[PDB]
Structures are given as C-alpha cells and as structure tokens.
Amino acid sequence: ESADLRALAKHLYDSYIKSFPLTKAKARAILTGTDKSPFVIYDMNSLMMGEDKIKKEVAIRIFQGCQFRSVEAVQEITEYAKSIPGFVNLDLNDQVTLLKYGVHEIIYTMLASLMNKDGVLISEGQGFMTREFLKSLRKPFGDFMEPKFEFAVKFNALELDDSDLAIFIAVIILSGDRPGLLNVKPIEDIQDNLLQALELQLKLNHPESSQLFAKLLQKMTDLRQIVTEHVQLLQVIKKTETDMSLHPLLQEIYK
C-alpha cells in the first residue's frame, strides 16, 4: 500500500530535518541569492580575514577543519540512522558495520548539496571556499576535493530535494552487501521497503523525470569510487605528515 510508503517517506524526511541542520534547501538559498550571503575565501588573505569574520601550514589547517567537520557529520548521520525504522533493532555489530561503510557515501552525497561548480559552503553556510582555491593547495591536499566536485556536478543535475535525499541516504545505510555483516537478511528486508519508498517518492516528486530511480541507484557507484580514491590519499598523508593526527572516530571508520 502506497499510504504506508508515504508515511515512511514523511517519517524519514522529518528525522532528516531534525538531524541535519544545513539542508539542501538552505544551501541553495545561500548559494543562489541579503541576510544569508556568505563570505568568500578564494586566496590566503581572504582566508586570514575569513577566520576573523566567520570562525601550521595553510593546507594542513584547512585539512584539519575538514577533519573536524567530518567527525561532526558522522555524528549527525549516526543520529539519523537510529531513526530509520528497524535499524536499532539490528545486531549491534551490524549497526557498527553499516555505519562504518555507509558514512562516507552519505557525506559525499550530502556535501553535493553544499556545492556548485565553483565551490563549497563551509562553517554552516557562513563561508564559501572556491573550488580553485582548494585545487591550488599543495600536494597532496589540492587533489582531495576535486573528485567530490566532479561527483556533485553530476549528482546535482538530478535535482533531488531534501525529501528525496532523506530516503536515498537511508537506502545507502541499509546496504546488505557490506563486508562482515553477520545477518544480511533483515538488513535487506529493510532496504527493500526503503527502495519501495524511494521509488514512490521519486515518481510522486519528479513525475516528468523518467527513470530517475534507476539513475539515482547508478549514482551509488560513483560514490564507492570516491571513497576508494579518498582512503588512498589519506594513506599518502599518514606517511608524508607523520606529525599530523587523524581523529580517532575517523581512524575507526577507516580500519
């Protein structure tokens, strides 16, 4: 019955709003156009005055604030996961495993909400760091964000809104094919109901967008690739910057 899927869609949207303070709707109002105009960081001076207005090497300090924001995002995604019906009733090891692998695919999904072709909102939308300034950071740091922009440009052309994303990131978390899952079947039963929900949601919300559901699920492939590329550059950093510390919560996601 569609009524039950609409109720699930509504539940997850409500929890998403509660768990993610910077939504895509807010990010697009900030990026498009008086009380919400962000300060723009495009070089080192705008950076140093940006810290003054908004709020070690330049690249490492940017990398470490990015680290802190990721930890914060992990916390938010975790809070959202527990609202997905059935999630907290799963085996606790499977909960950990589903978060461990799901968290980065969700981070880059939602970070797309904060991006356009030219840069990324930061500091809850108070700031905007341009793509070019990031790419000009010294190796290996200038190559961190470029694949994320490349994904976001394609992903953002689907024109999903927050109510679509709430279901989609739930579908991501409840992925039966994560390595080491002790009991795959109850996870998959939840995901099918979420997939049903996502499907009805995309049909109702984007009636003229043919096979959006299929196109969205195929994006769940560019995501895995970005994760793989990402952990590769972190390992470069561990050996390059033996003075630089990774946050422990992020340490455990990457083991």
Ligand SMILES: CCCCC/C=C/C/C=C\C/C=C/C/C=C/CCCC(=O)O
């Ligand atoms: C300034 C951190 C404030 C943390 C609370 C909320 C933050 C909103 C989201 C991100 C804020 C960015 C923090 C540090 C990142 C700077 C740019 C790194 C590249 C990127 O990340 O694309």
Ligand SMILES: *c1ccc([N+](=O)[O-])cc1C(=O)Nc1ccccc1
């Ligand atoms: C950038 C550099 C490093 C990490 N990491 O240490 O995992 C993460 C990121 C990143 O993509 N952070 C982030 C998360 C959410 C919003 C903006 C930036």
